[PDB]
């Protein structure tokens, strides 16, 4: 089976560089070329370049001349791409792709995420979201949880240690000013809260942080 395994996620400071690889298997590495594709926010795909494994000769997208550089070490069946002078515009997922003589990119790697941020490992601040007004009778109450100012991804959010699952919306994190921000909502019947306890469970493995934030009603 054809396999294209790419290097893990990268965390790079603005202006620095990074070199990501892509090891191939399941076929003769020399009878095919290797291409690279960029996918940013909105999931727009941009072709970066194509490289030959036997010669190292590359066909490049001129819009990436000052950004990307393709090399290959065919002994290890590994293709590299360097991204230099990184800015926020370079925060994206970069894909590996095989190119046979048909000039069709058929098999793709799992992708390498590159995140550009001047921030170090920062633990998150967890804020409870309580309704400003009392809930009506026999209605659904929506509670929330805001997780702000952390780096890097991922953070995990569950409610009542996973006992509340239906009505939970945890939203994709957004990177702003080198730090992430994430929110999570939960909807429970008004006869459940605040009569019973509802707790936000946040975990940030990169900083070994785990917090429980009880959602208390406002007065």
């Amino acid at each position: 089976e054809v396999q294209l395994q790419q290097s893990g996620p990268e965390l790079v400071k603005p202006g620095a560089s990074v070199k990501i690889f892509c090891k191939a298997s399941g076929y003769t590495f020399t009878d095919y070329n290797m291409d690279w594709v960029k996918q940013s926010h909105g999931k727009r795909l941009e072709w970066i370049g194509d490289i030959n494994p036997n010669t190292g000769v590359t066909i490049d997208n001129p819009k990436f001349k000052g950004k990307a550089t393709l090399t290959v070490d065919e002994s290890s069946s590994t293709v590299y791409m360097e991204l230099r002078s990184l800015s926020s515009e370079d925060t994206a997922v970069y894909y590996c792709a095989r190119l046979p003589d048909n000039y069709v990119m058929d098999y793709w790697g799992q992708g390498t995420s590159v995140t550009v941020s001047a921030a170090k490992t920062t633990p998150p601040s967890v804020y409870p979201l309580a309704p400003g007004s009392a809930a009506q009778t026999n209605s659904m109450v929506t509670l929330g949880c805001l997780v702000k100012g952390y780096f890097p991804e991922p953070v995990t959010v569950t409610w009542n240690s996973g006992s509340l699952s239906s009505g939970v919306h945890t939203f994709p994190a957004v990177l702003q000013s080198d730090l992430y921000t994430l929110s999570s909502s939960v909807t429970v019947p008004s006869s459940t809260w605040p009569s019973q306890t509802v707790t936000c469970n946040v975990a940030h493995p990169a900083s070994s942080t785990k917090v429980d934030k009880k959602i208390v009603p406002r007065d």
Partner: peptide, 11 residues
Amino acid sequence: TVSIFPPSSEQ
């Protein structure tokens, strides 16, 4: 289902 929340005391 629209729900708005004020800033928390902790924040």
